[PDB]
């Protein structure tokens with residue numbers, strides 16, 4: 001079903017996360033963590049205090065796909081366990097709960113445009129680009145269901 005998913009996404013905010021490599025998305029999926037540049041860290045912390053759910057939608061650059069999406073479960077914090085990101089300077093660490101670890105090809109989202117990025121297709125956007133509520137909700141609902149996920153515990157964090 002999609003009903004608990006819709007509940008988690010009701011009045012959520014959505015952000016496009018672009019990773020230079022698959023390894024960082026894999027660490028994020030394994031450890032439930034993300035870290036970004038301070039300009040985006042400040043935006044995510046503001047959004048986390050302002051919305052019932054803040055959703056990060058991940059895309060590896062040059063992959064032509066999204067690799068899943070996740071909900072912020074905390075603001076960023078420093079001094080936790082170190083994360084061996086593959087880098088080419090990162091802020092704190094956000095804890096995240098994954099909502100879907102399955103891929104979605106950009107060919108499947110070509111009908112969705114993001115008003116906050118000049119109504120360009122939602123796949124287009126810099127790291128940290130906010131996706132407007134309706135576009136972001138329909139993008140998340142496009143993903144194949146991830147039957148390994150139970151949103152019951154995520155609902156309890158809202």
Ligand SMILES: CNC(=O)c1cc(NC)ccn1
Nearest residue numbers: 019020024035036037085088
């Ligand atoms: C896990 N976080 C990253 O890989 C990242 C890298 C970056 N510049 C290379 C900017 C924001 N985030």
